[PDB]
Amino acid sequence: MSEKKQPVDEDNWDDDNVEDDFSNQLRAELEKHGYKMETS
Amino acid sequence: DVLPPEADSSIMMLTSDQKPDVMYADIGGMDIQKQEVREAVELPLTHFELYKQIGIDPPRGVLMYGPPGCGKTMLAKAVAHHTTAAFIRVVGSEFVQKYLGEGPRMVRDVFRLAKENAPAIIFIDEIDAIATKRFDAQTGADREVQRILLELLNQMDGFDQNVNVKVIMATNRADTLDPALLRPGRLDRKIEFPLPDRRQKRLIFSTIT
Amino acid sequence: MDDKALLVEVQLLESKTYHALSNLPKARAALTSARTTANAIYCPPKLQATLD
């Protein structure tokens, strides 16, 4: 059984949806606000 | 066929011509025991989640005693008037039936009616008619009563802390009793009714006059 | 000394003066000492309500 020939060769999901919207959007917000205190 | 439950020992204190007109104010000078039995019976009947939440093991049955004419029947009359729960009021020397079996079935159907009916209250008076000390297995008039005590001694153990069924028992002489009835898990709270003092006494003079 | 009943009066007077002079937790402490003292007297006939 399961011969299956070879043509080719939580803990994880809510963090993955945070990666879905938020994969790489500013990462470390710590000084952008203080860079907008003088511009804004 | 299965049956809806039945008992004849008592119905349920029919609630119209049944509540003896007796106010709490009719009893003067019993501030310890009135508030104390208020803690004992109906306060776990209402505020059950405090006894469960702090978890202080509310009493199953209560015993009350003393010299005669200290308001033993009277306090049960007033509590029976001001209760909201159902109330079962039996006369404690009627389980001695002529036929066998009518006694023990007469025991168990009362607690079946208290079980099925409501979070209710059992009252029993003259327990000295049943709970004696000595026995004699040569009459049948004694063996019957022996079985009567063994029934309710089984049945009080047949509870689970979840049913709100309280047993109030009042006698005259605590001496002629088996302490096997007074074991914990069955009886814990004991209330003597001491003779009126000169302080509570005046109050009774004020209320009666 | 021998007395118990006058201690209820002076502790209850402390319960007057610490809240009247705005020291709330010490007033709760002295009030508590008035409770656990006043439990042991057979006759507080008016000092009961005075504490109440």
């Binding site: - | 006894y51 939440q53 702090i54 202080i56 | 656990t36 439990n39 042991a40």
Partner: protein
């Protein structure tokens, strides 16, 4: 009488409708159970 106190201390927090037993309920109880020691 130790258990006579410690069982009783819940009645004070219950009669003031607490849900947590406080230390002053215990000394409120010792003055009752030892008053019963003072009784005869």
């Amino acid at each position: 009488e130790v258990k006579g106190v410690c069982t009783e201390a819940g009645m004070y927090a219950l009669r003031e409708r607490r849900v947590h037993v406080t230390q002053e309920d215990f000394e409120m109880a010792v003055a009752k159970v030892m008053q019963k020691d003072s009784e005869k």
